[PDB]
Amino acid sequence: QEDVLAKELEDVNKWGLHVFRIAELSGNRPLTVIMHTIFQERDLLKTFKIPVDTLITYLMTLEDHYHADVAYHNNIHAADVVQSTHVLLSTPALEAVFTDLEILAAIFASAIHDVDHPGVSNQFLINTNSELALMYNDSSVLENHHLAVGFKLLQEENCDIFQNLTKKQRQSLRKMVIDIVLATDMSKHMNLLADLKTMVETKKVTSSGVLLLDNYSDRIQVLQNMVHCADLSNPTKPLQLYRQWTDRIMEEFFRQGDRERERGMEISPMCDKHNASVEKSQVGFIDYIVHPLWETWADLVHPDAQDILDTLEDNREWYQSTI
Ligand SMILES: COc1c(OCCCCCCC(=O)O)cc2oc3cc4c(c(O)c3c(=O)c2c1CC=C(C)C)C=CC(C)(C)O4
Ligand SMILES: [Mg+2]
Numbered sequence: 001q002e003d004v005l006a007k008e009l010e011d012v013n014k015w016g017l018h019v020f021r022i023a024e025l026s027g028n029r030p031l032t033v034i035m036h037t038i039f040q041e042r043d044l045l046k047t048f049k050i051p052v053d054t055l056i057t058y059l060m061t062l063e064d065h066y067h068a069d070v071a072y073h074n075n076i077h078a079a080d081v082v083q084s085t086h087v088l089l090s091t092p093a094l095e096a097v098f099t100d101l102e103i104l105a106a107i108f109a110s111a112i113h114d115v116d117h118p119g120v121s122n123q124f125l126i127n128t129n130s131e132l133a134l135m136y137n138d139s140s141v142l143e144n145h146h147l148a149v150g151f152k153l154l155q156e157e158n159c160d161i162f163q164n165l166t167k168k169q170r171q172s173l174r175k176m177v178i179d180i181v182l183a184t185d186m187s188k189h190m191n192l193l194a195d196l197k198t199m200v201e202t203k204k205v206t207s208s209g210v211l212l213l214d215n216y217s218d219r220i221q222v223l224q225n226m227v228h229c230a231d232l233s234n235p236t237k238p239l240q241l242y243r244q245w246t247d248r249i250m251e252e253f254f255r256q257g258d259r260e261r262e263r264g265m266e267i268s269p270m271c272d273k274h275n276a277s278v279e280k281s282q283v284g285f286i287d288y289i290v291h292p293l294w295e296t297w298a299d300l301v302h303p304d305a306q307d308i309l310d311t312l313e314d315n316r317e318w319y320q321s322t323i
C-alpha cells in the first residue's frame with residue numbers, strides 16, 4: 001500500500017492532485033504526508049535544519065487536532081490548501097520572488113489555517129455566545145483560534161519544527177503566518193480583493209518578467225491572496241474533486257442548520273436542508289466570489305493561471321446547466 005501512496009504523491013506539484021485518494025492511502029494522514037512531501041520537495045528540512053522526526057511529530061499532532069466529524073473543514077481540506085498554495089508559489093511569474101522564510105510561512109500557514117475547526121461559522125459562534133466568540137470578541141473568531149492552536153502545538157514535546165530558526169526569523173515568520181491566516185476570514189475578502197485589484201492595476205514586472213514586490217506590505221498581500229485563493233480553489237479543480245468538496249461543505253452547512261433549528265434560531269443562508277439550492281449557490285458563489293478573485297489572480301500572474309481559470313468557468317457552466 002506504501003508504493004501506491006508514493007505513486008500518487010508523484011502528482012504533488014500538479015493542480016488537481018487526487019487528495020481524497022491520498023487521504024485513503026495514508027490511513028487518514030493526507031496533511032502529514034503531503035506536508036512532508038512538500039518540505040522534502042522544496043528542501044525545507046536542510047534549509048531550516050528541521051529534524052525529520054520533529055517534522056513528523058508536529059504534523060501528526062496538528063492533523064490530530066483537525067476534527068474527524070467535520071465533513072469539510074478537516075485535515076483533507078488543510079492538506080488540499082497546503083498543496084494548492086505549494087502549486088501557486090511555483091507559478092512562473094513569482095519565480096525567485098519570495099524568500100525561503102516567506103515560502104515556509106505560506107506553507108505553514110496553509111497547514112494550520114483551519115485547525116480545530118468546529119464545523120460552524122464565525123457568525124454562529126457569535127450568535128450563540130460561544131466560549132470562542134467571547135474569548136475573541138467576535139473578531140475573526142475561528143481564524144484567531146486556528147492560529148493559537150497551530151502555534152501552541154509547536155511547544156509540545158519534540159514538536160518545535162522552528163527550533164533552529166534565529167529569534168529574528170521566528171518573529172518574522174510568526175507575523176507573516178498570523179497575517180496570512182487572518183486573511184482567510186471571508187469577511188475580509190472584499191477589502192483583500194480590492195487591494196489585489198489595485199496591485200494588478202499598478203503592477204510592476206522586473207526585467208526577467210516576474211513580479212516586483214519592494215516592501216513587506218506588497219509581499220504579504222500577495223501571500224494573503226495566494227492562500228485565500230488556495231482556500232477558495234475547490235471550484236477551480238477537476239469536477240470529480242469539486243463535487244466531493246461541494247457534498248462536504250453542504251453536509252457541514254446543513255449540520256449547522258440543524259443545530260440552529262434545535263435552538264430555535266433563524267437558519268443561516270444555505271444551511272436549511274429543506275430549502276437549499278446547492279447548484280444555484282455554487283453558481284452564485286463562483287459568479288460573485290470565486291471567479292472575481294481568481295480572475296484578478298490570473299491577471300496578476302498572467303498567463304500562468306489561465307488553465308485554472310478555464311476549469312473554474314467550465315465548472316460554473318456545468319453546475320449552471322444542471323439547474
Ligand atoms: C461566507 O462567504 C460566502 C460563501 O462561503 C464560502 C463557503 C466555502 C469556503 C471554503 C473555504 C473554507 O471555508 O475553508 C458562500 C457564498 O455563497 C453565495 C451564494 C449565492 C449568493 C451569494 O451572495 C453568496 C455569498 O455571498 C457567499 C459568501 C459571502 C458571504 C458574505 C458576504 C457574508 C447570491 C445568490 C445565490 C443565492 C444564487 O448564491
Ligand atoms: Mg478557515
Ligand SMILES: [Zn+2]
Binds near residue numbers: 077113114184231
Ligand atoms: Zn479553509
